[model samples]
Target: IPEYVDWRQKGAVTPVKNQGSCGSCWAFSAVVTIEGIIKIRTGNLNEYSEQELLDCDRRSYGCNGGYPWSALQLVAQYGIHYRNTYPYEGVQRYCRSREKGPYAAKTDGVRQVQPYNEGALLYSIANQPVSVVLEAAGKDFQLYRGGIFVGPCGNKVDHAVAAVGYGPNYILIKNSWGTGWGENGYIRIKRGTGNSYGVCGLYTSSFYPVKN
Candidate 1:
Protein backbone atom coordinates (compact mmCIF):
# COMPACT_ATOMS: atom_id res chain seq x y z
CA ILE A 1 0.00 0.00 0.00
CA PRO A 2 1.06 3.60 -0.60
CA GLU A 3 0.15 4.54 2.94
CA TYR A 4 -1.84 7.43 1.49
CA VAL A 5 -4.58 8.14 -1.06
CA ASP A 6 -5.82 11.17 -2.97
CA TRP A 7 -9.21 11.15 -4.69
CA ARG A 8 -7.78 13.26 -7.52
CA GLN A 9 -5.34 10.44 -8.21
CA LYS A 10 -8.31 8.25 -9.00
CA GLY A 11 -10.17 10.90 -11.03
CA ALA A 12 -12.80 10.99 -8.32
CA VAL A 13 -12.26 14.65 -7.47
CA THR A 14 -12.89 17.79 -9.42
CA PRO A 15 -10.57 20.69 -10.16
CA VAL A 16 -10.02 23.42 -7.55
CA LYS A 17 -12.84 25.96 -7.30
CA ASN A 18 -13.07 29.50 -6.00
CA GLN A 19 -15.57 30.71 -3.43
CA GLY A 20 -14.66 34.35 -4.24
CA SER A 21 -15.72 36.94 -1.68
CA CYS A 22 -18.67 34.87 -0.53
CA GLY A 23 -18.61 32.81 2.63
CA SER A 24 -20.17 29.84 0.89
CA CYS A 25 -17.57 27.15 1.45
CA TRP A 26 -20.39 25.12 3.01
CA ALA A 27 -22.08 24.94 -0.37
CA PHE A 28 -18.79 24.38 -2.18
CA SER A 29 -17.71 21.64 0.21
CA ALA A 30 -21.05 19.83 0.25
CA VAL A 31 -21.53 20.20 -3.49
CA VAL A 32 -18.10 18.80 -4.28
CA THR A 33 -18.49 15.92 -1.87
CA ILE A 34 -21.76 15.02 -3.61
CA GLU A 35 -19.97 15.34 -6.94
CA GLY A 36 -17.36 12.98 -5.53
CA ILE A 37 -20.06 10.42 -4.65
CA ILE A 38 -21.75 10.89 -7.99
CA LYS A 39 -18.59 10.10 -9.96
CA ILE A 40 -17.64 7.17 -7.76
CA ARG A 41 -21.07 5.65 -8.38
CA THR A 42 -21.98 6.76 -11.92
CA GLY A 43 -18.53 7.43 -13.46
CA ASN A 44 -19.95 10.77 -14.61
CA LEU A 45 -18.12 13.76 -13.11
CA ASN A 46 -20.77 16.43 -13.21
CA GLU A 47 -20.43 19.78 -11.45
CA TYR A 48 -23.47 20.21 -9.27
CA SER A 49 -24.78 23.66 -8.43
CA GLU A 50 -23.68 25.37 -5.21
CA GLN A 51 -25.60 28.43 -6.27
CA GLU A 52 -28.74 26.38 -5.93
CA LEU A 53 -28.04 25.91 -2.27
CA LEU A 54 -27.06 29.55 -1.82
CA ASP A 55 -30.48 30.64 -2.98
CA CYS A 56 -32.80 27.70 -2.43
CA ASP A 57 -31.59 25.88 0.67
CA ARG A 58 -33.71 27.65 3.27
CA ARG A 59 -31.66 26.03 6.00
CA SER A 60 -28.59 28.15 5.17
CA TYR A 61 -27.76 31.86 5.03
CA GLY A 62 -26.38 31.96 1.46
CA CYS A 63 -23.34 34.32 1.20
CA ASN A 64 -23.44 34.73 4.95
CA GLY A 65 -22.23 31.10 5.39
CA GLY A 66 -23.90 27.86 6.48
CA TYR A 67 -23.18 24.34 7.68
CA PRO A 68 -22.56 21.32 5.48
CA TRP A 69 -24.89 19.27 7.69
CA SER A 70 -27.98 21.33 6.82
CA ALA A 71 -26.81 21.85 3.25
CA LEU A 72 -26.97 18.09 2.67
CA GLN A 73 -30.54 18.07 3.92
CA LEU A 74 -31.48 20.64 1.27
CA VAL A 75 -30.21 18.41 -1.53
CA ALA A 76 -32.19 15.50 -0.12
CA GLN A 77 -35.39 17.43 -0.63
CA TYR A 78 -35.03 19.40 -3.89
CA GLY A 79 -32.25 17.27 -5.33
CA ILE A 80 -29.67 19.53 -7.13
CA HIS A 81 -29.14 21.08 -10.51
CA TYR A 82 -26.15 21.12 -12.84
CA ARG A 83 -23.81 24.14 -12.65
CA ASN A 84 -25.06 25.25 -16.04
CA THR A 85 -28.59 25.43 -14.69
CA TYR A 86 -27.68 27.23 -11.46
CA PRO A 87 -24.42 29.13 -11.30
CA TYR A 88 -22.62 30.99 -8.50
CA GLU A 89 -22.41 34.78 -8.54
CA GLY A 90 -20.42 35.17 -5.31
CA VAL A 91 -23.49 36.83 -3.84
CA GLN A 92 -26.61 35.18 -2.50
CA ARG A 93 -29.61 35.65 -4.76
CA TYR A 94 -33.14 34.44 -5.46
CA CYS A 95 -33.78 30.69 -5.76
CA ARG A 96 -34.84 29.13 -9.03
CA SER A 97 -36.20 25.76 -10.13
CA ARG A 98 -36.35 23.90 -13.42
CA GLU A 99 -39.85 23.56 -14.76
CA LYS A 100 -38.91 20.22 -16.41
CA GLY A 101 -35.19 19.55 -16.14
CA PRO A 102 -33.61 16.78 -14.06
CA TYR A 103 -31.46 17.17 -10.96
CA ALA A 104 -27.80 16.29 -11.26
CA ALA A 105 -27.82 14.27 -8.07
CA LYS A 106 -29.90 13.19 -5.06
CA THR A 107 -29.18 12.02 -1.52
CA ASP A 108 -30.96 10.00 1.17
CA GLY A 109 -29.33 12.02 3.99
CA VAL A 110 -25.88 12.36 5.52
CA ARG A 111 -23.95 10.11 7.91
CA GLN A 112 -22.05 11.69 10.77
CA VAL A 113 -18.82 9.95 11.64
CA GLN A 114 -17.95 9.51 15.31
CA PRO A 115 -17.02 13.00 16.41
CA TYR A 116 -13.40 13.66 17.44
CA ASN A 117 -12.31 10.19 16.32
CA GLU A 118 -9.33 10.49 13.98
CA GLY A 119 -9.37 6.78 13.19
CA ALA A 120 -12.96 6.95 11.96
CA LEU A 121 -12.30 10.17 10.04
CA LEU A 122 -9.26 8.73 8.31
CA TYR A 123 -11.01 5.46 7.59
CA SER A 124 -13.89 7.31 5.99
CA ILE A 125 -11.54 9.29 3.74
CA ALA A 126 -9.92 6.07 2.49
CA ASN A 127 -13.23 5.46 0.70
CA GLN A 128 -14.68 8.92 -0.12
CA PRO A 129 -14.20 12.63 0.41
CA VAL A 130 -15.36 13.70 3.89
CA SER A 131 -16.79 17.15 4.57
CA VAL A 132 -15.53 19.09 7.58
CA VAL A 133 -16.11 22.40 9.33
CA LEU A 134 -13.05 23.98 10.87
CA GLU A 135 -11.68 27.22 12.27
CA ALA A 136 -10.18 28.62 9.09
CA ALA A 137 -10.26 32.17 10.43
CA GLY A 138 -6.58 32.86 11.02
CA LYS A 139 -3.99 35.16 9.54
CA ASP A 140 -1.69 32.17 9.12
CA PHE A 141 -4.36 30.29 7.19
CA GLN A 142 -5.36 33.40 5.29
CA LEU A 143 -1.87 33.68 3.79
CA TYR A 144 -0.87 30.01 3.68
CA ARG A 145 0.80 29.06 0.39
CA GLY A 146 2.08 25.46 0.65
CA GLY A 147 3.42 22.49 2.62
CA ILE A 148 1.52 20.57 5.32
CA PHE A 149 -0.37 23.36 7.17
CA VAL A 150 0.46 23.50 10.86
CA GLY A 151 -2.17 25.98 11.86
CA PRO A 152 -1.72 28.49 14.66
CA CYS A 153 -5.37 29.21 13.94
CA GLY A 154 -8.61 29.46 15.86
CA ASN A 155 -10.86 26.69 17.20
CA LYS A 156 -14.25 28.02 16.30
CA VAL A 157 -15.01 26.65 12.84
CA ASP A 158 -15.62 29.43 10.32
CA HIS A 159 -14.96 27.54 7.08
CA ALA A 160 -16.12 24.25 5.57
CA VAL A 161 -14.02 21.98 3.32
CA ALA A 162 -13.55 18.36 2.22
CA ALA A 163 -10.84 15.78 2.92
CA VAL A 164 -9.79 14.10 -0.30
CA GLY A 165 -6.94 11.98 1.03
CA TYR A 166 -4.87 11.04 4.06
CA GLY A 167 -1.72 9.28 5.19
CA PRO A 168 0.17 8.63 8.40
CA ASN A 169 0.99 12.26 9.03
CA TYR A 170 -1.40 14.51 7.13
CA ILE A 171 -4.87 14.89 5.58
CA LEU A 172 -5.34 16.44 2.14
CA ILE A 173 -8.21 18.94 1.81
CA LYS A 174 -9.79 20.76 -1.09
CA ASN A 175 -10.65 24.44 -0.68
CA SER A 176 -12.91 26.80 -2.63
CA TRP A 177 -10.48 29.69 -2.64
CA GLY A 178 -9.30 29.16 -6.24
CA THR A 179 -5.91 28.10 -7.62
CA GLY A 180 -4.23 31.34 -6.59
CA TRP A 181 -3.99 30.00 -3.06
CA GLY A 182 -2.24 27.10 -1.34
CA GLU A 183 -0.97 24.14 -3.37
CA ASN A 184 -3.28 24.74 -6.27
CA GLY A 185 -6.44 25.14 -4.22
CA TYR A 186 -5.65 22.29 -1.86
CA ILE A 187 -4.04 22.24 1.57
CA ARG A 188 -2.58 19.39 3.58
CA ILE A 189 -3.62 19.68 7.23
CA LYS A 190 -1.26 17.97 9.65
CA ARG A 191 -2.83 15.02 11.41
CA GLY A 192 -1.68 12.28 13.82
CA THR A 193 -0.66 15.02 16.22
CA GLY A 194 -3.07 13.66 18.82
CA ASN A 195 -5.55 16.57 18.86
CA SER A 196 -8.74 14.46 18.73
CA TYR A 197 -10.56 17.31 17.00
CA GLY A 198 -7.91 17.38 14.24
CA VAL A 199 -5.65 20.36 13.38
CA CYS A 200 -8.56 22.53 12.31
CA GLY A 201 -11.31 20.64 14.06
CA LEU A 202 -11.23 18.17 11.19
CA TYR A 203 -12.98 15.51 13.22
CA THR A 204 -15.49 17.86 14.74
CA SER A 205 -18.18 17.92 12.04
CA SER A 206 -17.13 15.31 9.52
CA PHE A 207 -19.80 14.17 7.06
CA TYR A 208 -20.63 12.64 3.64
CA PRO A 209 -23.72 12.22 1.51
CA VAL A 210 -25.67 8.95 1.47
CA LYS A 211 -26.63 8.64 -2.16
CA ASN A 212 -30.09 7.40 -3.02
Candidate 2:
Protein backbone atom coordinates (compact mmCIF):
# COMPACT_ATOMS: atom_id res chain seq x y z
CA ILE A 1 0.00 0.00 0.00
CA PRO A 2 1.03 3.60 -0.40
CA GLU A 3 2.60 5.41 2.53
CA TYR A 4 0.04 8.24 2.61
CA VAL A 5 -3.26 9.16 0.96
CA ASP A 6 -5.48 12.24 1.04
CA TRP A 7 -8.83 11.96 -0.73
CA ARG A 8 -9.25 15.72 -0.63
CA GLN A 9 -5.95 16.17 -2.45
CA LYS A 10 -7.07 13.49 -4.93
CA GLY A 11 -10.42 15.30 -5.51
CA ALA A 12 -12.65 12.61 -4.08
CA VAL A 13 -13.88 14.67 -1.12
CA THR A 14 -16.18 17.67 -1.08
CA PRO A 15 -15.64 20.89 0.86
CA VAL A 16 -16.28 21.20 4.59
CA LYS A 17 -19.78 21.95 5.84
CA ASN A 18 -21.63 23.10 8.92
CA GLN A 19 -24.00 21.00 10.98
CA GLY A 20 -25.28 24.03 12.87
CA SER A 21 -26.87 23.67 16.34
CA CYS A 22 -28.06 20.20 15.49
CA GLY A 23 -26.63 16.79 16.22
CA SER A 24 -26.45 15.84 12.57
CA CYS A 25 -22.81 14.91 12.33
CA TRP A 26 -23.69 11.28 11.66
CA ALA A 27 -25.71 12.26 8.59
CA PHE A 28 -22.92 14.53 7.42
CA SER A 29 -20.27 11.87 7.83
CA ALA A 30 -22.30 9.18 6.08
CA VAL A 31 -23.36 11.45 3.21
CA VAL A 32 -19.78 12.58 2.68
CA THR A 33 -18.52 9.02 2.64
CA ILE A 34 -21.01 8.31 -0.15
CA GLU A 35 -20.00 11.55 -1.83
CA GLY A 36 -16.35 10.50 -1.61
CA ILE A 37 -16.85 7.15 -3.32
CA ILE A 38 -19.14 8.55 -6.01
CA LYS A 39 -16.60 11.23 -6.87
CA ILE A 40 -13.81 8.69 -6.94
CA ARG A 41 -15.85 6.64 -9.41
CA THR A 42 -17.35 9.40 -11.57
CA GLY A 43 -14.71 12.16 -11.56
CA ASN A 44 -17.16 14.86 -10.46
CA LEU A 45 -17.57 16.07 -6.90
CA ASN A 46 -21.33 15.79 -6.43
CA GLU A 47 -22.62 16.99 -3.11
CA TYR A 48 -25.27 14.77 -1.62
CA SER A 49 -27.87 15.71 0.98
CA GLU A 50 -27.14 15.09 4.61
CA GLN A 51 -30.55 16.49 5.33
CA GLU A 52 -32.06 13.67 3.33
CA LEU A 53 -30.64 11.21 5.83
CA LEU A 54 -31.82 13.30 8.72
CA ASP A 55 -35.28 13.23 7.23
CA CYS A 56 -35.62 9.74 5.80
CA ASP A 57 -33.13 7.43 7.46
CA ARG A 58 -35.46 5.44 9.69
CA ARG A 59 -32.65 3.70 11.49
CA SER A 60 -31.13 6.97 12.68
CA TYR A 61 -32.33 9.50 15.24
CA GLY A 62 -31.72 12.57 13.10
CA CYS A 63 -30.33 15.64 14.89
CA ASN A 64 -30.47 13.92 18.25
CA GLY A 65 -27.54 11.57 17.31
CA GLY A 66 -27.14 8.52 15.11
CA TYR A 67 -24.79 6.05 13.44
CA PRO A 68 -22.99 6.34 10.12
CA TRP A 69 -23.63 2.69 9.35
CA SER A 70 -27.40 3.21 9.59
CA ALA A 71 -27.26 6.19 7.26
CA LEU A 72 -25.07 4.27 4.81
CA GLN A 73 -27.57 1.46 4.94
CA LEU A 74 -30.27 3.93 3.93
CA VAL A 75 -28.34 4.87 0.78
CA ALA A 76 -27.50 1.26 0.06
CA GLN A 77 -31.16 0.38 0.07
CA TYR A 78 -32.91 3.41 -1.44
CA GLY A 79 -30.22 5.69 -2.90
CA ILE A 80 -29.86 9.37 -1.94
CA HIS A 81 -30.69 12.94 -2.99
CA TYR A 82 -28.29 15.69 -4.07
CA ARG A 83 -27.67 18.89 -2.16
CA ASN A 84 -29.24 21.02 -4.88
CA THR A 85 -32.43 19.05 -4.53
CA TYR A 86 -32.84 18.09 -0.89
CA PRO A 87 -30.27 20.44 0.66
CA TYR A 88 -28.95 20.79 4.21
CA GLU A 89 -31.08 22.71 6.68
CA GLY A 90 -29.19 21.53 9.77
CA VAL A 91 -32.50 20.32 11.21
CA GLN A 92 -34.46 17.12 10.94
CA ARG A 93 -37.16 17.85 8.44
CA TYR A 94 -39.98 15.80 7.02
CA CYS A 95 -39.00 13.11 4.51
CA ARG A 96 -39.69 14.85 1.23
CA SER A 97 -37.10 12.93 -0.78
CA ARG A 98 -39.66 10.20 -1.33
CA GLU A 99 -41.40 12.34 -3.95
CA LYS A 100 -38.79 14.85 -5.12
CA GLY A 101 -35.46 13.01 -5.21
CA PRO A 102 -34.49 11.57 -8.55
CA TYR A 103 -31.62 10.04 -6.58
CA ALA A 104 -28.12 11.42 -7.09
CA ALA A 105 -26.28 8.30 -5.98
CA LYS A 106 -26.55 4.71 -4.84
CA THR A 107 -24.30 2.17 -3.14
CA ASP A 108 -24.28 -1.59 -3.43
CA GLY A 109 -23.26 -2.12 0.18
CA VAL A 110 -21.28 -0.78 3.10
CA ARG A 111 -17.91 -2.05 4.31
CA GLN A 112 -16.81 -1.46 7.89
CA VAL A 113 -13.29 -1.42 9.24
CA GLN A 114 -12.99 -3.82 12.11
CA PRO A 115 -12.76 -1.86 15.37
CA TYR A 116 -9.29 -1.12 16.79
CA ASN A 117 -7.40 -2.57 13.82
CA GLU A 118 -5.34 0.18 12.29
CA GLY A 119 -3.95 -2.20 9.67
CA ALA A 120 -7.41 -2.78 8.15
CA LEU A 121 -8.30 0.86 8.72
CA LEU A 122 -5.12 1.87 6.90
CA TYR A 123 -6.10 -0.26 3.95
CA SER A 124 -9.69 1.03 3.93
CA ILE A 125 -8.94 4.73 4.29
CA ALA A 126 -6.08 4.51 1.75
CA ASN A 127 -8.67 3.75 -0.92
CA GLN A 128 -11.61 5.93 0.21
CA PRO A 129 -12.77 8.30 2.91
CA VAL A 130 -14.30 6.43 5.81
CA SER A 131 -16.98 7.54 8.28
CA VAL A 132 -15.61 7.41 11.82
CA VAL A 133 -17.03 8.34 15.21
CA LEU A 134 -15.15 9.58 18.27
CA GLU A 135 -15.39 11.66 21.42
CA ALA A 136 -15.56 15.26 20.17
CA ALA A 137 -17.21 17.12 23.03
CA GLY A 138 -14.03 17.94 24.92
CA LYS A 139 -12.82 21.51 25.29
CA ASP A 140 -9.72 20.72 23.22
CA PHE A 141 -11.96 19.55 20.36
CA GLN A 142 -14.44 22.40 20.71
CA LEU A 143 -11.54 24.84 20.53
CA TYR A 144 -9.38 22.88 18.11
CA ARG A 145 -7.81 25.41 15.74
CA GLY A 146 -5.13 23.16 14.20
CA GLY A 147 -2.31 20.67 14.65
CA ILE A 148 -2.40 16.95 15.36
CA PHE A 149 -4.87 16.43 18.20
CA VAL A 150 -3.36 14.35 20.96
CA GLY A 151 -6.01 15.46 23.40
CA PRO A 152 -7.06 14.21 26.80
CA CYS A 153 -10.48 12.86 25.86
CA GLY A 154 -12.39 9.73 26.62
CA ASN A 155 -13.58 6.86 24.37
CA LYS A 156 -17.22 7.88 24.37
CA VAL A 157 -17.83 7.97 20.58
CA ASP A 158 -20.05 11.03 20.68
CA HIS A 159 -19.64 12.46 17.17
CA ALA A 160 -18.96 11.29 13.65
CA VAL A 161 -16.49 12.65 11.06
CA ALA A 162 -14.77 11.59 7.88
CA ALA A 163 -11.31 9.99 8.01
CA VAL A 164 -10.04 11.16 4.66
CA GLY A 165 -6.33 10.37 4.93
CA TYR A 166 -3.34 9.55 7.11
CA GLY A 167 0.41 10.04 7.50
CA PRO A 168 2.77 8.69 10.12
CA ASN A 169 0.60 8.27 13.23
CA TYR A 170 -2.10 10.78 12.38
CA ILE A 171 -5.47 10.53 10.62
CA LEU A 172 -6.76 13.53 8.66
CA ILE A 173 -10.44 14.13 9.40
CA LYS A 174 -13.12 16.26 7.81
CA ASN A 175 -15.57 17.56 10.39
CA SER A 176 -19.11 18.86 9.98
CA TRP A 177 -18.69 21.53 12.60
CA GLY A 178 -17.50 23.85 9.77
CA THR A 179 -14.15 25.41 8.80
CA GLY A 180 -14.17 27.52 11.94
CA TRP A 181 -14.03 24.44 14.16
CA GLY A 182 -10.75 22.74 13.37
CA GLU A 183 -8.02 23.04 10.73
CA ASN A 184 -10.18 24.45 7.97
CA GLY A 185 -12.94 22.03 8.93
CA TYR A 186 -10.44 19.22 9.35
CA ILE A 187 -8.50 17.65 12.22
CA ARG A 188 -5.50 15.38 12.26
CA ILE A 189 -5.72 13.21 15.35
CA LYS A 190 -3.21 10.81 16.85
CA ARG A 191 -3.71 7.30 15.52
CA GLY A 192 -2.48 3.88 16.69
CA THR A 193 -2.27 5.16 20.25
CA GLY A 194 -2.30 1.60 21.61
CA ASN A 195 -5.87 1.97 22.90
CA SER A 196 -7.88 -1.01 21.70
CA TYR A 197 -10.55 1.41 20.48
CA GLY A 198 -8.06 4.12 19.44
CA VAL A 199 -7.63 7.64 20.77
CA CYS A 200 -11.00 9.27 21.46
CA GLY A 201 -12.59 5.98 20.36
CA LEU A 202 -11.99 6.62 16.67
CA TYR A 203 -11.57 2.92 15.96
CA THR A 204 -14.89 2.13 17.58
CA SER A 205 -17.12 3.08 14.67
CA SER A 206 -15.71 3.11 11.13
CA PHE A 207 -17.51 2.44 7.87
CA TYR A 208 -17.45 3.19 4.12
CA PRO A 209 -19.86 2.92 1.22
CA VAL A 210 -19.24 0.52 -1.68
CA LYS A 211 -20.54 0.60 -5.24
CA ASN A 212 -20.21 -2.05 -7.92
Candidate 3:
Protein backbone atom coordinates (compact mmCIF):
# COMPACT_ATOMS: atom_id res chain seq x y z
CA ILE A 1 0.00 0.00 0.00
CA PRO A 2 2.96 2.30 -0.53
CA GLU A 3 2.01 5.96 -0.88
CA TYR A 4 -0.79 5.81 -3.39
CA VAL A 5 -0.48 7.13 -6.96
CA ASP A 6 -1.87 10.11 -5.08
CA TRP A 7 -1.61 9.91 -1.26
CA ARG A 8 -5.18 11.18 -1.07
CA GLN A 9 -6.64 8.12 -2.77
CA LYS A 10 -8.36 7.61 0.62
CA GLY A 11 -9.09 3.89 0.42
CA ALA A 12 -5.57 2.63 -0.18
CA VAL A 13 -5.51 -1.09 0.65
CA THR A 14 -2.80 -3.72 1.42
CA PRO A 15 -3.15 -7.46 1.07
CA VAL A 16 -2.23 -10.16 3.64
CA LYS A 17 -0.18 -12.69 1.75
CA ASN A 18 1.04 -15.90 3.42
CA GLN A 19 4.11 -15.58 1.15
CA GLY A 20 2.93 -18.59 -0.90
CA SER A 21 -0.32 -17.26 -2.39
CA CYS A 22 -2.06 -16.84 0.98
CA GLY A 23 -2.20 -13.13 0.02
CA SER A 24 -3.84 -11.95 3.23
CA CYS A 25 -1.24 -9.44 4.35
CA TRP A 26 -3.80 -6.70 4.80
CA ALA A 27 -5.67 -8.63 7.49
CA PHE A 28 -2.42 -9.89 8.93
CA SER A 29 -1.19 -6.34 9.43
CA ALA A 30 -4.34 -5.29 11.24
CA VAL A 31 -4.67 -8.37 13.41
CA VAL A 32 -1.01 -8.82 14.24
CA THR A 33 -0.70 -5.21 15.34
CA ILE A 34 -3.57 -5.79 17.71
CA GLU A 35 -1.83 -8.97 18.81
CA GLY A 36 1.39 -7.10 19.49
CA ILE A 37 -0.47 -4.41 21.37
CA ILE A 38 -2.18 -7.09 23.39
CA LYS A 39 1.15 -8.74 24.04
CA ILE A 40 2.60 -5.45 25.18
CA ARG A 41 -0.39 -4.58 27.32
CA THR A 42 -1.05 -7.92 29.01
CA GLY A 43 2.01 -9.99 28.27
CA ASN A 44 -0.45 -12.30 26.61
CA LEU A 45 -0.44 -13.05 22.89
CA ASN A 46 -3.93 -14.49 23.18
CA GLU A 47 -5.52 -11.06 22.94
CA TYR A 48 -6.61 -11.75 19.37
CA SER A 49 -6.39 -14.16 16.51
CA GLU A 50 -5.11 -13.21 13.04
CA GLN A 51 -7.21 -15.96 11.49
CA GLU A 52 -10.38 -14.73 13.15
CA LEU A 53 -9.74 -11.27 11.80
CA LEU A 54 -9.22 -12.91 8.39
CA ASP A 55 -12.24 -15.17 8.29
CA CYS A 56 -14.93 -13.57 10.47
CA ASP A 57 -14.19 -9.97 9.73
CA ARG A 58 -15.88 -9.79 6.35
CA ARG A 59 -15.85 -6.03 5.84
CA SER A 60 -12.38 -5.99 4.37
CA TYR A 61 -11.34 -8.04 1.35
CA GLY A 62 -9.55 -11.09 2.76
CA CYS A 63 -6.96 -13.35 1.07
CA ASN A 64 -4.66 -10.86 -0.65
CA GLY A 65 -7.12 -8.01 -0.04
CA GLY A 66 -7.97 -5.37 2.68
CA TYR A 67 -7.96 -1.77 3.83
CA PRO A 68 -5.89 -0.39 6.77
CA TRP A 69 -8.47 0.81 9.27
CA SER A 70 -10.93 -2.04 8.83
CA ALA A 71 -9.32 -4.23 11.50
CA LEU A 72 -8.58 -1.32 13.81
CA GLN A 73 -12.14 -0.17 13.67
CA LEU A 74 -13.35 -3.73 14.29
CA VAL A 75 -11.13 -4.26 17.33
CA ALA A 76 -11.94 -0.85 18.72
CA GLN A 77 -15.49 -2.15 18.65
CA TYR A 78 -15.36 -5.88 19.35
CA GLY A 79 -12.40 -5.79 21.80
CA ILE A 80 -10.89 -8.87 20.11
CA HIS A 81 -11.02 -12.47 21.33
CA TYR A 82 -8.11 -13.80 23.44
CA ARG A 83 -5.27 -15.23 21.37
CA ASN A 84 -4.49 -18.11 23.77
CA THR A 85 -7.85 -19.58 22.85
CA TYR A 86 -7.11 -19.06 19.16
CA PRO A 87 -3.48 -19.21 18.13
CA TYR A 88 -2.15 -18.32 14.68
CA GLU A 89 -2.69 -20.78 11.83
CA GLY A 90 0.96 -20.53 10.74
CA VAL A 91 2.07 -19.30 7.31
CA GLN A 92 0.99 -22.61 5.75
CA ARG A 93 -2.37 -22.74 7.49
CA TYR A 94 -5.54 -20.61 7.76
CA CYS A 95 -8.72 -20.75 9.84
CA ARG A 96 -11.83 -18.79 10.87
CA SER A 97 -13.11 -17.68 14.25
CA ARG A 98 -16.13 -19.48 15.59
CA GLU A 99 -17.28 -16.66 17.84
CA LYS A 100 -19.09 -13.67 16.36
CA GLY A 101 -20.43 -11.69 19.27
CA PRO A 102 -22.25 -8.39 18.92
CA TYR A 103 -20.19 -5.35 19.82
CA ALA A 104 -19.73 -1.69 18.97
CA ALA A 105 -16.50 0.24 18.34
CA LYS A 106 -16.29 3.80 19.61
CA THR A 107 -14.75 5.41 16.52
CA ASP A 108 -15.70 8.97 17.17
CA GLY A 109 -13.10 11.44 15.85
CA VAL A 110 -10.47 8.91 14.87
CA ARG A 111 -7.68 11.10 13.49
CA GLN A 112 -5.25 9.33 11.15
CA VAL A 113 -2.26 11.44 10.27
CA GLN A 114 -0.59 11.19 6.89
CA PRO A 115 2.53 13.05 7.99
CA TYR A 116 4.30 15.37 5.61
CA ASN A 117 7.54 15.42 7.62
CA GLU A 118 9.89 13.08 9.45
CA GLY A 119 9.44 14.88 12.75
CA ALA A 120 5.69 14.42 12.65
CA LEU A 121 6.04 10.70 11.87
CA LEU A 122 8.54 10.27 14.66
CA TYR A 123 6.20 12.09 16.98
CA SER A 124 3.47 9.58 16.23
CA ILE A 125 5.79 6.64 16.85
CA ALA A 126 6.90 8.09 20.19
CA ASN A 127 3.35 8.64 21.36
CA GLN A 128 1.78 5.31 20.42
CA PRO A 129 2.41 2.01 18.70
CA VAL A 130 1.82 2.91 15.04
CA SER A 131 0.99 1.21 11.78
CA VAL A 132 3.45 2.30 9.10
CA VAL A 133 2.11 3.48 5.80
CA LEU A 134 4.87 2.57 3.36
CA GLU A 135 5.55 2.39 -0.32
CA ALA A 136 7.01 -1.13 -0.91
CA ALA A 137 10.70 -1.16 -1.62
CA GLY A 138 13.12 -3.76 -3.06
CA LYS A 139 12.67 -5.33 -6.53
CA ASP A 140 9.47 -4.21 -8.26
CA PHE A 141 7.04 -1.90 -6.46
CA GLN A 142 4.32 -3.94 -8.03
CA LEU A 143 2.47 -6.34 -5.62
CA TYR A 144 5.22 -8.94 -5.13
CA ARG A 145 8.09 -9.87 -2.75
CA GLY A 146 8.19 -10.81 0.96
CA GLY A 147 9.80 -8.01 3.03
CA ILE A 148 11.12 -4.60 1.83
CA PHE A 149 14.39 -2.67 1.71
CA VAL A 150 14.12 0.98 2.88
CA GLY A 151 17.33 2.54 1.60
CA PRO A 152 17.14 5.04 -1.26
CA CYS A 153 15.01 2.54 -3.16
CA GLY A 154 12.51 5.35 -3.74
CA ASN A 155 9.84 3.65 -1.65
CA LYS A 156 6.74 5.48 -0.53
CA VAL A 157 4.45 4.91 2.48
CA ASP A 158 1.73 3.15 0.49
CA HIS A 159 1.56 -0.05 2.54
CA ALA A 160 0.41 -0.13 6.17
CA VAL A 161 1.68 -2.29 9.09
CA ALA A 162 2.70 -2.10 12.73
CA ALA A 163 5.58 0.07 13.96
CA VAL A 164 6.71 -1.73 17.11
CA GLY A 165 10.01 -0.03 17.93
CA TYR A 166 12.65 2.25 16.43
CA GLY A 167 16.35 1.82 17.07
CA PRO A 168 18.92 4.62 17.08
CA ASN A 169 19.33 4.41 13.26
CA TYR A 170 16.28 2.49 12.05
CA ILE A 171 12.54 2.31 12.54
CA LEU A 172 11.64 -1.29 13.39
CA ILE A 173 8.65 -2.60 11.41
CA LYS A 174 6.70 -5.88 11.41
CA ASN A 175 5.39 -7.50 8.24
CA SER A 176 2.99 -10.33 7.41
CA TRP A 177 5.38 -11.71 4.81
CA GLY A 178 6.31 -14.42 7.36
CA THR A 179 9.68 -15.02 8.99
CA GLY A 180 11.16 -16.47 5.78
CA TRP A 181 11.87 -12.97 4.42
CA GLY A 182 14.53 -10.37 5.11
CA GLU A 183 15.38 -9.34 8.69
CA ASN A 184 12.85 -11.94 9.76
CA GLY A 185 10.32 -10.44 7.35
CA TYR A 186 10.63 -6.95 8.79
CA ILE A 187 12.19 -3.66 7.63
CA ARG A 188 14.25 -1.21 9.63
CA ILE A 189 14.03 2.10 7.78
CA LYS A 190 16.20 5.17 8.35
CA ARG A 191 14.77 7.33 11.11
CA GLY A 192 14.83 10.85 9.66
CA THR A 193 14.25 9.92 6.03
CA GLY A 194 10.95 11.58 5.35
CA ASN A 195 11.32 10.33 1.80
CA SER A 196 10.67 6.85 3.22
CA TYR A 197 7.70 5.79 5.36
CA GLY A 198 8.59 8.31 8.07
CA VAL A 199 6.68 10.87 6.04
CA CYS A 200 3.86 8.56 5.03
CA GLY A 201 1.28 10.12 7.42
CA LEU A 202 0.68 6.83 9.29
CA TYR A 203 -2.10 6.52 11.89
CA THR A 204 -2.61 5.28 15.49
CA SER A 205 -5.65 4.88 17.75
CA SER A 206 -4.34 7.31 20.41
CA PHE A 207 -5.92 5.05 23.00
CA TYR A 208 -4.03 4.16 26.15
CA PRO A 209 -3.29 0.58 27.14
CA VAL A 210 -4.99 -1.15 30.08
CA LYS A 211 -2.21 -0.38 32.52
CA ASN A 212 -1.15 -3.36 34.61
Reference-based lDDT, each prediction: 0.85, 0.88, 0.48
What does candidate 2's lDDT look like per residue over 13-105, in tens digits? 888999999999999999889988998888888999899999988888888988899899989998998898998888887999868848878
What does candidate 2 score in Cα RMSD to the true structure? Answer: 1.0
lDDT of 2 at 183: 87
So what's the TM-score on candidate 1? 0.95
Q: Please, what is the TM-score per model?
A: 0.95, 0.97, 0.63
Q: Pick the candidate with the highest TM-score.
A: 2
Tell me the spans in candidate 2 whose CA falls farther than 4 Å from its real position: none
**Sorted by TM-score, highest first, which candidate order results?**
2, 1, 3
Superposed model 1: Cα runs more than 4 Å off: none
Superior by TM-score: candidate 1 or candidate 3: 1
- For model 1, state the Cα shift of residue 187 in Å: 0.3
Strongest candidate by lDDT? 2
What tens digits encode model 3's per-residue C-alpha lDDT throughout 84-128?
Answer: 555456342343333444321122222354545555555555544
lDDT at 61, model 2: 87
Query: Which pairs in model 2 have colliding backbones?
Result: none
